[PDB]
Amino acid sequence: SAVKAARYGKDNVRVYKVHKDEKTGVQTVYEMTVCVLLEGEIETSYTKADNSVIVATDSIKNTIYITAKQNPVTPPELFGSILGTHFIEKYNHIHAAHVNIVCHRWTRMDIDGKPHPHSFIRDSEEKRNVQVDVVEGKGIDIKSSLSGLTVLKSTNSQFWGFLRDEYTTLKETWDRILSTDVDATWQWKNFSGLQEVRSHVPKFDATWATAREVTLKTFAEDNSASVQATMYKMAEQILARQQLIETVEYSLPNKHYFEIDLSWHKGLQNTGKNAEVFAPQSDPNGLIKCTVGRSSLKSKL
Amino acid sequence: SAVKAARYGKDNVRVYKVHKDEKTGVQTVYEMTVCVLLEGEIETSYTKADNSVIVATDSIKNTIYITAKQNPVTPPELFGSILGTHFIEKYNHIHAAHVNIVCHRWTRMDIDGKPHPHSFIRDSEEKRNVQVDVVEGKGIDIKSSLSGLTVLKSTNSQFWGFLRDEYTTLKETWDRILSTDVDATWQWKNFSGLQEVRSHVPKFDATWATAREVTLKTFAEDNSASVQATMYKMAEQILARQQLIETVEYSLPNKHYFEIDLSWHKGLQNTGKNAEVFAPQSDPNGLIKCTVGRSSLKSKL
Amino acid sequence: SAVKAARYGKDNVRVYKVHKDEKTGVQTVYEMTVCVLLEGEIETSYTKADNSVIVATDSIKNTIYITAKQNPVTPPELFGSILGTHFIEKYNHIHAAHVNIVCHRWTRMDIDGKPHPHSFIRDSEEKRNVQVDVVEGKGIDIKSSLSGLTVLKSTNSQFWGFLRDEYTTLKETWDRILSTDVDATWQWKNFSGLQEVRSHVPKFDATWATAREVTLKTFAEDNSASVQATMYKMAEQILARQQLIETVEYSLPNKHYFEIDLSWHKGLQNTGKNAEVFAPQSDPNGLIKCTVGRSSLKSKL
Amino acid sequence: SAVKAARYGKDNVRVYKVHKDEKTGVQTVYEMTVCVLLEGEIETSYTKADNSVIVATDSIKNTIYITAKQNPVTPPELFGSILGTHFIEKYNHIHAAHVNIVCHRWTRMDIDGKPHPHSFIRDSEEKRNVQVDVVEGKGIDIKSSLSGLTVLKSTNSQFWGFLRDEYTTLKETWDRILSTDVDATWQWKNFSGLQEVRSHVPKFDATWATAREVTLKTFAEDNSASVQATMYKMAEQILARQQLIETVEYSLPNKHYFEIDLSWHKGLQNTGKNAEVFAPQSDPNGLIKCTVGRSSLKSKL
Ligand SMILES: CN1C(=O)N[C@@]2(OO)C(=O)NC(=O)N=C12
Ligand SMILES: CN1C(=O)N[C@@]2(OO)C(=O)NC(=O)N=C12
Ligand SMILES: CN1C(=O)N[C@@]2(OO)C(=O)NC(=O)N=C12
Ligand SMILES: CN1C(=O)N[C@@]2(OO)C(=O)NC(=O)N=C12
């Protein structure tokens, strides 16, 4: 046998950081969950009981906290790039660092209509994430995402004109509920190293905000022909607004809300135009995915 | 043997309802999870295989949807009271109905600074709940609550002066993080029946809003001596603001954030005044409870 | 205002203990999650910022580990009684200790047909639990339980003869699937203190084993008229086999498996006698409860 | 813009099937959760609101149940291959089907030492899974796995000789607890189509059993130098026992159990040789991965 692939590290590292402005009194908090997995000349730890090549996962954990103490933790694209760069530079034999960060929401409270200097609310389980792959000799590959953004619209969703054959029972509809949990990812141009990442720092928060704004407005305003059609519109708009993105990926469950025929009980009318009470379905669910990039077709368009 | 207690019914009934204003176009959505458990002269279903006394749980489910079609689902205190009253009135042999409702958030989206007529966001996993116990001959007992309201303050929390003995390692502190998931319950005066519940309908939304406002403002503004002291202040204020409440209960985890001594690494200072990076602890957690009512002591106060 | 009820302590305390037989080499492991909440003369911690009355939850945590080091952790009824007794004896002003223990399975592996001396498998998420309430001047109240015991039978379950009215759609059946997650609790006679608990120690493991055996055999062998009828049979048998139990409680979800009519597709027959493929329903679910004790009726039986 | 990748289908489809031997009375149950995602000439559903190319996810769901009615559901490698083949053959424009199956345990109960004909227990949350990718013109790629197999050994695990630098605090150890949740995957040689899959059917259950046996015996018997070294031994043995496997992947968390120094309390000794009570750590956790294949090095070995 031989090792074809290997990576190892510390997962589920919870990290909080506070910033205190001593002049104003305003405090700002950041909370995340971090995973760092390393690759390199480590195969003998597996094949030969050679622990000399292992940077202990406990040490990786220590390193995450030390790096958070010595550097900004925001934007997460930057923090992940710093962290990943550290491992490949510090250790000659480590040649890739794979850093995943999940950022948790701590939104400043408004009390009596004024932002409070040191109190926060988890206003959504929506996350902001990064995946930062730092590969020695091949720069820094970053995928940014938002996830867990749960939305519903009560009309202006349709689904008709789909293929009908002997496996089909679904009724066409011109007016349904649409609900999903948005997972949207934007993949950056490869960066050559930490300097190039730093050179684009403002773009990270700005692009996250654009992606979220586009998602919400397109969901709310598109009289939707399908999940497929709506999600494509989101992606094409995000690409148009940030040239340093190469692709946008959406992964969207179709969280079905079924009508309930109550006509068996006193002729109650609760379907079609009279549908008011619905049964949310926990499972199963449609799952619709696509990755959108910029076009390069010049003929047969 | 004999049956000392019995109740049965349908749990985990997911319910959506929409309201459509055909004049304005504005739609409003409600989503909940409902449980109804019945008591009564049902013991022979257990002892004698006598199914004649069983209102099938499937029928209970149907009844939940029919009741939602025929009645408002808001405030949940009202809906639960209607639902529970139905079972004890419809079925001579059923003498109590226990209705639990968890209300899920669907907050209207603002798009380009304007409220959207039919698009919504799950802006928090915080819930609004009721427990409505309709007991034939003894009226309607309602407990209302908010739960899953997750908050953090980064300073203005203290914990010193606690008992110290041979089991104690904890350091006193004059400046710590405080974070919790708020579960707050207000218990109403017994209502004689559905008419009395209906007579107080506006008070339900108003008292929920008061409880939430008091919780947030007291958490944010109290320079806290302990979880115990802070939560008591919340409860006493809610009681002062609604005379139809008899008691207020809080159940609060103390979600610990530990300092990380980094002085072993290059003399880094990350404790006390220089603490910036902390380790959120998933477990264990303090758990602090109290039920507060109005005083009746006239001496030794 | 005044404090009507209060309790506080440490929840979610994970504990492992190993026993090593140095003669034989056999090691045995125990893992649990512990909660201890205290009551007593603590109201001024809430009303007056008086922390002097607080045994810190951090100290409660330390105490759990020290007690596990100094005492057996099995049976959990005993460990909980020791732990709870400690708090009311050590602290004059603490008058009740409420100890909840969840015991996790670590079953010894058999390797090549021989029990291994120090390797274990989590063979089920089923738990064995206790609730031990140590109340000064009123002894020790113990409720023992098994939970998370998930079972299914594919036939020999029926449900017919239930009430039928204008809310009823359910078809009677003489042959269905029955599946549940068993939560079964046996409530012991009050014990006067720790000596009386110790005097009955062998009965704890023996009664847990009886309850589990009765549950499984009655589920498997009863041609069930209903969940209600089957669960009552379980309870009556457990009571007959341990006179120091006062009551047995079951709480059983009815985890529905629906037939799927496929006759619309090529006349496929998948209902009634030809039902082979079913749709497990995640929600909603029936929920059936009862508490059974010994009879005291002497007339009208 | 243009669609660079797309797939869509139905996720979280719960499926039960029973087999009834009418001669013997013995019934056998199977339960799974199925996901099917399709690829093909579907881009216009995203770009042009062209629903004609969509096989509705509701129809995919129907198809899963019809296929389970008409075919064996075991081994899951076979069922997934049948299912996936159906979509690419039935629909000219669909060119790949990606079928994921999670198989749930329903182990036959033994009652009074005899296997019961129709009663089952969920004896573990361990799963048996498949990922079957049916790609038109490129055969059938199958990855089989076991997951959720949670184990612990109380000694015969070590971790010393790892890299030590200014980021390292971890103490070397010659005797520790090792616990993990095993996720093990074996990747089959590409199959040309359904006939070739069928030709190897007995190998699927046999290889799953081998992988599980090797995992448990190697975990129990290896005096482990590291997670890395132990997991490599597992993989190399599985490869040696099934030549139709190309690679074996393990993904193993290191679920840490920390010693608790109690020497501050009455000089209690609970570390090193006297360690009995430990604190299981929920997070963070090491995470150790490798993919092992057969060697092709002929020099510098
Ligand atoms: C109702 N429905 C389907 O049955 N398939 C679809 O995804 O779930 C699909 O492909 N797209 C939808 O928008 N709606 C759907
Ligand atoms: C740090 N700490 C404790 O150790 N006990 C306490 O609850 O968790 C307590 O009783 N009250 C607190 O506010 N803080 C605590
Ligand atoms: C199918 N079914 C019901 O509709 N009600 C019941 O509980 O879920 C009930 O009361 N008892 C059952 O055993 N089966 C049921
Ligand atoms: C204690 N410990 C580490 O700190 N790193 C390791 O994974 O978690 C590692 O690389 N391998 C281990 O077996 N044990 C470890």
mmCIF file of C-alpha atoms in Angstrom, chain B residues 21-116:
data_model
loop_
_atom_site.group_PDB
_atom_site.id
_atom_site.type_symbol
_atom_site.label_atom_id
_atom_site.label_comp_id
_atom_site.label_asym_id
_atom_site.label_seq_id
_atom_site.Cartn_x
_atom_site.Cartn_y
_atom_site.Cartn_z
ATOM 1 C CA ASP B 21 -55.382 41.419 1.824
ATOM 2 C CA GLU B 22 -56.851 41.490 -1.673
ATOM 3 C CA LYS B 23 -57.264 45.325 -1.579
ATOM 4 C CA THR B 24 -53.646 46.175 -0.661
ATOM 5 C CA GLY B 25 -51.826 43.050 -1.857
ATOM 6 C CA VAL B 26 -50.163 42.636 1.507
ATOM 7 C CA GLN B 27 -49.811 39.017 2.639
ATOM 8 C CA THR B 28 -48.935 37.942 6.144
ATOM 9 C CA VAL B 29 -47.683 34.483 7.159
ATOM 10 C CA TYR B 30 -47.785 32.449 10.363
ATOM 11 C CA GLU B 31 -45.962 29.207 11.027
ATOM 12 C CA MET B 32 -46.088 27.022 14.112
ATOM 13 C CA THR B 33 -45.583 23.565 15.516
ATOM 14 C CA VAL B 34 -48.543 22.261 17.537
ATOM 15 C CA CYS B 35 -49.024 19.525 20.107
ATOM 16 C CA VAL B 36 -52.416 18.548 21.530
ATOM 17 C CA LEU B 37 -52.707 15.920 24.267
ATOM 18 C CA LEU B 38 -56.054 14.894 25.706
ATOM 19 C CA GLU B 39 -57.144 13.520 29.091
ATOM 20 C CA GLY B 40 -60.467 12.039 30.177
ATOM 21 C CA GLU B 41 -62.381 8.832 30.630
ATOM 22 C CA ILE B 42 -59.847 6.938 28.514
ATOM 23 C CA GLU B 43 -58.385 4.403 30.897
ATOM 24 C CA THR B 44 -60.102 1.429 29.223
ATOM 25 C CA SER B 45 -58.106 2.038 26.035
ATOM 26 C CA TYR B 46 -55.098 1.063 28.133
ATOM 27 C CA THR B 47 -56.597 -1.647 30.343
ATOM 28 C CA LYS B 48 -59.267 -3.343 28.140
ATOM 29 C CA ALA B 49 -58.182 -2.730 24.490
ATOM 30 C CA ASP B 50 -61.231 -0.397 24.311
ATOM 31 C CA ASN B 51 -60.539 1.868 21.351
ATOM 32 C CA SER B 52 -64.057 3.365 21.417
ATOM 33 C CA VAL B 53 -62.871 6.043 23.855
ATOM 34 C CA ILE B 54 -60.007 7.120 21.583
ATOM 35 C CA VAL B 55 -60.309 10.199 19.454
ATOM 36 C CA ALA B 56 -57.601 9.081 17.033
ATOM 37 C CA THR B 57 -54.450 11.188 17.028
ATOM 38 C CA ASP B 58 -54.900 11.371 13.228
ATOM 39 C CA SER B 59 -58.294 13.035 13.905
ATOM 40 C CA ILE B 60 -56.663 15.411 16.398
ATOM 41 C CA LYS B 61 -54.262 16.395 13.581
ATOM 42 C CA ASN B 62 -57.177 16.981 11.178
ATOM 43 C CA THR B 63 -58.860 19.082 13.878
ATOM 44 C CA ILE B 64 -55.784 21.290 14.302
ATOM 45 C CA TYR B 65 -55.832 22.162 10.569
ATOM 46 C CA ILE B 66 -59.643 22.665 10.470
ATOM 47 C CA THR B 67 -59.456 24.931 13.543
ATOM 48 C CA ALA B 68 -56.654 26.974 11.895
ATOM 49 C CA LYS B 69 -58.814 27.324 8.738
ATOM 50 C CA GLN B 70 -61.848 28.562 10.739
ATOM 51 C CA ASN B 71 -60.167 30.859 13.271
ATOM 52 C CA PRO B 72 -57.304 33.263 13.716
ATOM 53 C CA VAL B 73 -54.022 31.611 14.600
ATOM 54 C CA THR B 74 -52.818 34.752 16.399
ATOM 55 C CA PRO B 75 -52.228 35.516 19.176
ATOM 56 C CA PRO B 76 -51.195 31.932 19.946
ATOM 57 C CA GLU B 77 -52.805 32.181 23.420
ATOM 58 C CA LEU B 78 -56.157 32.623 21.684
ATOM 59 C CA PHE B 79 -55.660 29.923 19.084
ATOM 60 C CA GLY B 80 -54.600 27.442 21.741
ATOM 61 C CA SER B 81 -57.625 28.297 23.875
ATOM 62 C CA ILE B 82 -60.014 27.819 20.944
ATOM 63 C CA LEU B 83 -58.398 24.542 20.046
ATOM 64 C CA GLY B 84 -58.403 23.192 23.570
ATOM 65 C CA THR B 85 -61.992 24.288 24.257
ATOM 66 C CA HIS B 86 -63.117 22.427 21.110
ATOM 67 C CA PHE B 87 -61.963 19.057 22.451
ATOM 68 C CA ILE B 88 -63.577 19.310 25.873
ATOM 69 C CA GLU B 89 -66.839 20.637 24.428
ATOM 70 C CA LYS B 90 -67.096 18.279 21.441
ATOM 71 C CA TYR B 91 -66.358 15.085 23.383
ATOM 72 C CA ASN B 92 -68.301 14.532 26.606
ATOM 73 C CA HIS B 93 -65.702 12.054 27.902
ATOM 74 C CA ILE B 94 -62.652 14.276 27.266
ATOM 75 C CA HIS B 95 -62.051 16.517 30.267
ATOM 76 C CA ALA B 96 -58.726 18.228 29.550
ATOM 77 C CA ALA B 97 -56.843 19.407 26.515
ATOM 78 C CA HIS B 98 -53.184 20.382 26.733
ATOM 79 C CA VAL B 99 -52.126 22.541 23.795
ATOM 80 C CA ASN B 100 -48.492 23.508 23.227
ATOM 81 C CA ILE B 101 -47.634 25.877 20.368
ATOM 82 C CA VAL B 102 -44.182 26.923 19.164
ATOM 83 C CA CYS B 103 -44.390 29.960 16.852
ATOM 84 C CA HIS B 104 -41.595 30.326 14.232
ATOM 85 C CA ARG B 105 -40.414 33.711 13.032
ATOM 86 C CA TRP B 106 -41.309 34.968 9.586
ATOM 87 C CA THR B 107 -40.365 38.623 9.601
ATOM 88 C CA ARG B 108 -41.325 40.748 6.589
ATOM 89 C CA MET B 109 -38.357 41.645 4.370
ATOM 90 C CA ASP B 110 -37.401 45.232 3.697
ATOM 91 C CA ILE B 111 -36.228 45.617 0.118
ATOM 92 C CA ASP B 112 -34.670 48.923 -0.904
ATOM 93 C CA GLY B 113 -35.975 50.337 2.380
ATOM 94 C CA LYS B 114 -39.645 49.358 1.784
ATOM 95 C CA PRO B 115 -41.539 46.473 3.438
ATOM 96 C CA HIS B 116 -42.178 43.770 0.872
#
